[PDB]
Curated annotation (Swiss-Prot):
Name the UniProt record assigns to this protein: Vacuolar protein sorting-associated protein 26B
Gene Ontology terms: biological process: cellular response to type II interferon; intracellular protein transport; regulation of neurotransmitter receptor localization to postsynaptic specialization membrane; retrograde transport, endosome to Golgi
A Pfam family matched in the record: Vps26
InterPro entries xrefs: Arrestin-like_C (IPR014752), Vps26-related (IPR028934)
Subunit: Component of the heterotrimeric retromer cargo-selective complex (CSC), also described as vacuolar protein sorting subcomplex (VPS), formed by VPS26 (VPS26A or VPS26B), VPS29 and VPS35. The CSC has a highly elongated structure with VPS26 and VPS29 binding independently at opposite distal ends of VPS35 as central platform. The CSC is believed to associate with variable sorting nexins to form functionally distinct retromer complex variants.
Chief subcellular location: cytoplasm
Purpose of the protein: Acts as a component of the retromer cargo-selective complex (CSC). The CSC is believed to be the core functional component of retromer or respective retromer complex variants acting to prevent missorting of selected transmembrane cargo proteins into the lysosomal degradation pathway. The recruitment of the CSC to the endosomal membrane involves RAB7A and SNX3. The SNX-BAR retromer mediates retrograde transport of cargo proteins from endosomes to the trans-Golgi network (TGN) and is involved in endosome-to-plasma membrane transport for cargo protein recycling.
Domain of life according to the entry: Eukaryota
Record membrane topology: Peripheral membrane protein
Expression by tissue: Ubiquitously expressed in developing embryo and adult. Highly expressed in brain.
Family that this chain belongs to: Belongs to the VPS26 family.
Organism: Mus musculus (Mouse)
Length: 288
């Protein structure tokens, strides 16, 4: 009876970002940053141009909220702005209503995770006696940072006295999202017979919900290094292209509800099928 659209000013020109939604599917959403004005109009179209629409008011909201999958009915809005667009009355005619929210606070980057989602959206509501007409439209927020940062390489060792000394050296402890992890694996001592080696990027998601803490992992990338036994004096250059990976910045204690942290995990498997692991955190940040 009423089709409601949310149309942003300069929709057709404004930046859109790809985002992996809850069912694994990728879509584009309008992209915003902290502080940016959110502007547009709410358009009502009447299915029958002759009939009047009785309502108890028309509203648009901008909302940022955290949705905890273990407590999914409980909304944890951290920013909510409300602009009433019409007092109760009557709509006899298809029309649009302008809106502008200025200085819009968006302190956290959008995130769709395993046990949590952090999302922003615009919600247009026509209040009715019977059933309200509600239309939402998601928007995506990114958070930029800047870091120093100078040439201080990091070392990751697997060391078994008298048996194994394998060293992975890489260029930074922090990387932006399209950066390259530049490193080298050195085989200093190889008395154990190794049959496979790889380096993985692991995302670890930590969520609090009620009195409980949930942990989930996701292997983002597997860089297969070598099959068969390495010998001492060999050296393998490593370049991991982060731009080919689906990545968010590191997120720590987001409104004390969740964390997203990233690790390099060096994996060796010997001829006896024994796993040897070693991990170090890398801080991922978004460069503007």
């Amino acid at each position: 009876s009423v089709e409601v659209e949310i149309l942003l000013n300069d929709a057709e020109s404004r930046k859109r970002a790809e985002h992996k939604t809850e069912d694994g599917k990728k879509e584009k959403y309008f992209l915003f940053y902290d502080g940016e004005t959110v502007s547009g109009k709410v358009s009502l179209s009447l299915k029958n141009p002759n009939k009047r629409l009785e309502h108890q008011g028309i509203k648009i909201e901008f909302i940022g909220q955290i949705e905890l999958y273990y407590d999914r009915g409980n909304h944890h809005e951290f920013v909510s702005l409300v602009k009433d667009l019409a007092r109760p009355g009557e709509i006899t005619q298809s029309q649009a209503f302008d809106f502008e929210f200025t200085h819009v606070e968006k302190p956290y980057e959008s995130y769709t995770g395993q046990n949590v989602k952090l999302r922003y959206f615009l919600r247009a509501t026509i209040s009715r006696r019977l059933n309200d007409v509600v239309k939402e439209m998601d928007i995506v927020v990114h958070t930029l940072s800047t870091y120093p940062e100078l040439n201080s390489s990091i070392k990751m060792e697997v060391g078994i006295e008298d048996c194994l000394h394998i060293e992975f050296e890489y260029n930074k402890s922090k990387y932006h999202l399209k950066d390259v992890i530049v490193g080298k694996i050195y085989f200093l001592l190889v008395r154990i017979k190794i049959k496979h080696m790889e380096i993985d990027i692991i995302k670890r998601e930590t969520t609090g919900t009620g009195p409980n803490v949930y942990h989930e992992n996701d292997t983002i990338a597997k860089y297969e290094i070598m099959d068969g036994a390495p010998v001492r004096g060999e050296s393998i250059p490593i370049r991991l292209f982060l731009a080919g990976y689906e990545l968010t910045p590191t997120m720590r204690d987001i409104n004390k509800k969740f964390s997203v942290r990233y690790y390099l995990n060096l994996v060796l498997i010997d001829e006896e099928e024994r796993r040897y692991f070693k991990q170090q955190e890398v801080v991922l940040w978004r460069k503007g």
